């Protein structure tokens, strides 16, 4: 496997989004993963509608809109729905709204999704290198997470009790510290222009490899 990977260099990652006061991290994680696959398949980079997931992938998928959701069930909704609209056609409002999906605005489809084995960072590395960005959950509740600015994030108080859905778009090594390149959805003001490098191969730090999954088209 390559020593390092960064899907941004392959034009497979869209601009960092700002979820605001709506707990839609799961939706942004899911669309980010599908966006890479869409780019890989069609050659076109297109932001997908996180709002579409918030408003439509709901109760039936065990999701709660602005109150939380799952990337895997969001993927299944896209499969069941036979599509997901573009962000431009169905903009993000950081609120729970009535489902307004319209296939006339469909920008991607999903045929299946895969959940990686729990806590295996080597398997996660293989997937990020060979398949594309991977949706994951991390423990982002520690004060240090919000204040991250640079370097490689390592928090002794971190746990494998994850609460925040984000996207791994790469991995590598910085000054002797291996890391996972993570795309957050708290806008460009957070961390390194919206990204955070989180410790890799450090005992599944913050649960980053606890619940990984990626869709396919
Ligand atoms: C509790 N609050 C809700 C929104 C948030 C995001 N944004 N997190 C979530 O949506 C997380 C993401 C999930 C990804 C997969 C591994 C486990 C975590 N989910 C989540 O909080 N719920 C609670 C409601 O029932 C559905 C799941 C931040 C924390």
Curated annotation (Swiss-Prot):
Transmembrane segments: none annotated. Disulfide bonds join 12-110, 22-66, 56-99, 158-206. It comes from the Eukaryota. It is an enzyme of class 3 (hydrolase). Keywords: Cytoplasmic vesicle, Disulfide bond, Glycoprotein, Hydrolase, Lysosome, Protease, Secreted, Signal, Thiol protease, Zymogen. It catalyses: Similar to cathepsin L, but with much less activity on Z-Phe-Arg-|-NHMec, and more activity on the Z-Val-Val-Arg-|-Xaa compound. GO terms for molecular function: collagen binding; cysteine-type endopeptidase activity; cysteine-type peptidase activity; fibronectin binding; laminin binding; proteoglycan binding; serine-type endopeptidase activity. GO terms for biological process: adaptive immune response; antigen processing and presentation; antigen processing and presentation of exogenous peptide antigen via MHC class II; antigen processing and presentation of peptide antigen; basement membrane disassembly; cellular response to thyroid hormone stimulus; collagen catabolic process; extracellular matrix disassembly. Its EC number is 3.4.22.27. Belongs to the peptidase C1 family. Thiol protease. Key protease responsible for the removal of the invariant chain from MHC class II molecules and MHC class II antigen presentation. The bond-specificity of this proteinase is in part similar to the specificities of cathepsin L. Monomer. This is Cathepsin S. It comes from Homo sapiens (Human).
